Design a protein around this ligand. Structure first.
Ligand SMILES: Cc1cc2nc3c(=O)[nH]c(=O)nc-3n(C[C@H](O)[C@H](O)[C@H](O)COP(=O)(O)OP(=O)(O)OC[C@H]3O[C@@H](n4cnc5c(N)ncnc54)[C@H](O)[C@@H]3O)c2cc1C
Ligand SMILES: Cc1cc2nc3c(=O)[nH]c(=O)nc-3n(C[C@H](O)[C@H](O)[C@H](O)COP(=O)(O)OP(=O)(O)OC[C@H]3O[C@@H](n4cnc5c(N)ncnc54)[C@H](O)[C@@H]3O)c2cc1C
Lengths: 43, 472, 471
């Protein structure tokens, strides 16, 4: 379950949330998770 | 004396003005062209705004003139209607909001060009003023947001005097004794209710068998209709109009029949409101000489980035497919411009809410039971009547309910339908939940302020999830 | 003499909700109430009756004042039939009390009428008026005895000229002048009600802001400013030294600066005393069971709402936490669930607060002050209702939405709304916080146009992206 914006961020950088891990309330892939992948990739 | 820019937007309505502003805020040298005297388009000048204002004022007039205020100890001499003053409040709000967009343009340095826009080259648009004045704009991108117009009814000529479109209906000069409305969709029901409250004998005639337009949940539509009829608003569903005639005394004879033929009858009225629908406006935009062909409905085909065939020319809002709603046009205008700057562009239309601003209000988002059944999706139903909600009962405004549709096994919220007090605002909590792929459980968990109408939404979700609510 | 699995003492928001969920989870349940009706404070002399008067007085003001005239709704004269207005309120209360009743019948939750006293770790005894008594043996005991009005030292409330919120809600006539002691939520709502109905009202508050605890300061000051414009007067940073009944039935209230000096006297016809409320645990048997209340008179509980005796739980107004009806209900639910073997959480930073005046005020999460105090770095997003389409079309533009988000994670820390629709709008915020939403998340949620909620969307946007579209 991607959070809106997390979904927006992942699309903008062509990333698949599977690559990361959801760190948000009740199994949500938050805007922080999305950014941790854009970072922990373009790192 | 040409001028240039990165993005030129044709149309200053919900989609257009919001796109122009966002474009500028993204750095794009932006221009917005508008042929009418004011910005804001349909919604602002003859749509959402004026209609919500008259809906608000007529609702209050009804509360004071009827038994509501008396039931609360507010006793009055004689409640009189000053229609012109009621029209003035509406006009003042509209004028303030139009002035606001002009100011928001200057603030974000969006260049406002007055005139009729016409694409005269893949990277050029020519605005022509009424006086003949011309202005050329060479642009990298062109954004089409020309919106919509009233769909005429074959054989009946709207003149905005006794035969009106929604525009003429928003400005009548006196309460008509009797009014007939062709079409019981959102716009028709709203305007019909406005005049019914003010004293008109109102009847809406509709081809289909339900009111509220496309997508409305059937149970919701039927309950809504029952309430409106109890208010005095009449309906002739599964009925076709075969023609209308102006009479010797200024009245109008509208001839009708059952949709399937037969049961012919005539109903006479002082004002005939025609609102069977609205359609994409693209008149002399120059789309032909550019090879941009419309679909059968007259819309401009576009991809997920809102690009037309010619990749540097986009289209959004009422002029393209999807719900013809203001917020829909705004979202598209926003993601389109963000898209021009490399941003994502995926927009889930299943999360666009619909609202009918009558009283009771109706609002919904997601899918109706009919759609779930059509897609063969197995589901659970959660219902909670406002008559069981504290704030609603305290306010003595208890019509309707909140109906939640959940995926039979994943308890995921599939649809939220609201008929009653505050439906309009409440549907946004619903929208946000869908955008998060919420489950009935998720919502049921959230602590909602007591007493609030939203508790009906929370509890309907609990009844779906757990199978029982607390207060019902 | 009967028995059950769970016995709840008190049928208010926390009590009756807890009782119903219990039977709904298979627990044989009994609920005991001393009053003639169920519902507790909120339903009988609290939330409900006050919202009814706020609603009615607001409509009275729109019709009696300039609002309706500006809309073409003309009336030669508009007058108040207070009895009738009071009747609408009580008709509402009575309907809702019968409702709780019916809900107990429906969920087979047994109702015992009497003052309940915990006579043993697994026994509760209730005593009626006539003198009779009912013995209740239970494995579990849930105490949701709630609260009572906090009295003011030196001034005795008689519910005549000197009333508490209970008396203020049933006044028999509009007082020519009224003094309110305490400018918190309850005081501001009740004083606004009477100010609209025609009373010359003044609230005296020891603290320097109206609204109670936790309310954002900027929100509190804008709110105050609007109420004063309405004619509601305030005496902040002021102490009430005493009050005296006068020859003509009026009341002289003597006041002076909080820090000292500038003594004055204000005469009124009715004195509303509402400096606070406190947990009610009188003659419950706790002093014998070894249950030691904390200083403020509250029952100390743990995460599972357990007391000293693990089979005895306390929820709602009797325990710490915001003394709100929904807070009481949430606790009563998670407690019962935990009892049936379930986890129990409740982030009190997600329990909203609403002020039902007009403009309304509502918020959830943290205020600017709490953030500064906590050392949390943040950013601010504000959107005035004056720029919100629906607000403007309705010609009801007071206020704004203010969003607070972390300077770096863009996470939503708190939301404060002052203006139309705040009360319902805060619940969209509560949902957003429960998902750890960021400002961008909300800004990217499609909101219907035109709705007041667009103000919330645009505020989250100005905070997330730096600027909104319409302002
Ligand atoms: C009576 C009524 C009530 C409504 N109520 C609601 C409601 O409550 N909620 C809701 O969501 N929707 C409502 N709608 C629909 C809503 O108004 C439209 O969905 C919305 O305006 C679509 O926005 P748009 O920007 O695409 O187009 P529009 O706002 O229709 O038009 C944008 C602008 O394009 C301009 N334009 C067109 N061609 C040219 C050209 N060649 N050169 C220059 N300018 C041009 C037009 O003059 C116009 O100002 C209502 C509509 C009506 C008629
Ligand atoms: C004027 C006013 C307005 C308010 N407005 C709001 C508002 O808008 N929003 C909001 O959230 N909160 C509001 N509140 C507060 C709200 O009413 C309380 O937070 C809520 O009632 C707490 O619920 P409770 O169940 O814990 O306790 P209560 O409802 O206070 O009490 C529960 C019950 O316990 C019973 N009881 C106690 N001891 C015994 C015993 N020994 N035997 C039998 N029965 C017993 C009492 O008689 C009572 O009925 C308002 C309060 C007042 C006074």
């Amino acid at each position: 379950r991607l959070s809106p914006a997390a979904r927006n961020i992942l699309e903008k950088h062509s990333l698949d949330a599977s690559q990361g891990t959801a760190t948000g309330p009740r199994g949500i892939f938050t805007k922080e998770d999305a950014l941790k992948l854009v970072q922990l990739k373009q790192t | 004396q040409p001028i240039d820019a990165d993005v030129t937007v044709i149309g200053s309505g919900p989609g257009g003005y919001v796109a122009a502003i966002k474009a500028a805020q993204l750095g794009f040298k932006t221009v917005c062209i508008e042929k009418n005297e004011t910005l804001g388009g349909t919604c602002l000048n003859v749509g959402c705004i004026p209609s919500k204002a008259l809906l608000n004022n007529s609702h209050y007039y009804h509360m004071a003139h009827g038994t509501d205020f008396a039931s609360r100890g507010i006793e009055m001499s004689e409640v009189r209607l000053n229609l012109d003053k009621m029209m003035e409040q509406k006009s003042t709000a509209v004028k303030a909001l139009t002035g606001g967009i002009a100011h928001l343009f200057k603030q974000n340095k969006v260049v406002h060009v007055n005139g009729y826009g016409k694409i005269t080259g893949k990277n050029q648009v020519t605005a022509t003023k009424a006086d003949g004045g011309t202005q050329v704009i060479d642009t990298k991108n062109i954004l089409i947001a020309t919106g919509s117009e009233v769909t005429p009814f074959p054989g009946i000529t709207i003149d905005e005097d006794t035969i009106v479109s929604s525009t003429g209906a928003l400005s009548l000069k006196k309460v008509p004794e009797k009014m007939v409305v062709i079409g019981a969709g959102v716009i028709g029901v709203e305007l019909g209710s406005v005049w019914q409250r003010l004293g008109a004998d109102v009847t809406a005639v509709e081809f289909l068998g339900h009111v509220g337009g496309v997508g409305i949940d059937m149970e919701i539509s039927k309950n809504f209709q029952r309430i409106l009829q109890k208010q005095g608003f009449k309906f002739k569903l599964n009925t076709k109009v075969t023609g209308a005639t102006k009479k010797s005394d200024g009245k109008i004879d509208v001839s009708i029949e059952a949709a399937s033929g037969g049961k012919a009858e005539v109903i006479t009225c002082d004002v005939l409101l025609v609102c069977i629908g609205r359609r994409p406006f693209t008149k002399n935009l120059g789309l032909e000489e550019l090879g941009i062909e419309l679909d059968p409905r007259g819309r401009i085909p576009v991809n997920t980035r809102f690009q037309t065939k010619i990749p540097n020319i986009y289209a959004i809002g009422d002029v393209v497919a999807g719900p013809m709603l203001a917020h829909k046009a705004e979202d598209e205008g926003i993601i389109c411009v963000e898209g021009m700057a490399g941003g994502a562009v995926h927009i889930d239309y299943n999360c666009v809410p619909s609202v009918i601003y009558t009283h009771p209000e109706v609002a919904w988002v997601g899918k109706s039971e009919e759609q779930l059944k059509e897609e063969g999706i197995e589901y659970k139903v959660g219902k909670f009547p406002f008559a069981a909600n504290s704030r609603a009962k305290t306010n003595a405004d208890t019509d309707g309910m909140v109906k939640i549709l959940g995926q039979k096994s994943t308890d995921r919220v599939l649809g939220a339908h609201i008929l009653g007090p505050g439906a309009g605002e409440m549907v946004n909590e619903a929208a946000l939940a869908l955008e998060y792929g919420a489950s009935c459980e998720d919502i049921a968990r959230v602590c909602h302020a007591h007493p609030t109408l939203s508790e009906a939404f929370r509890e309907a979700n609990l009844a779906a999830s757990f199978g029982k609510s607390i207060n019902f």
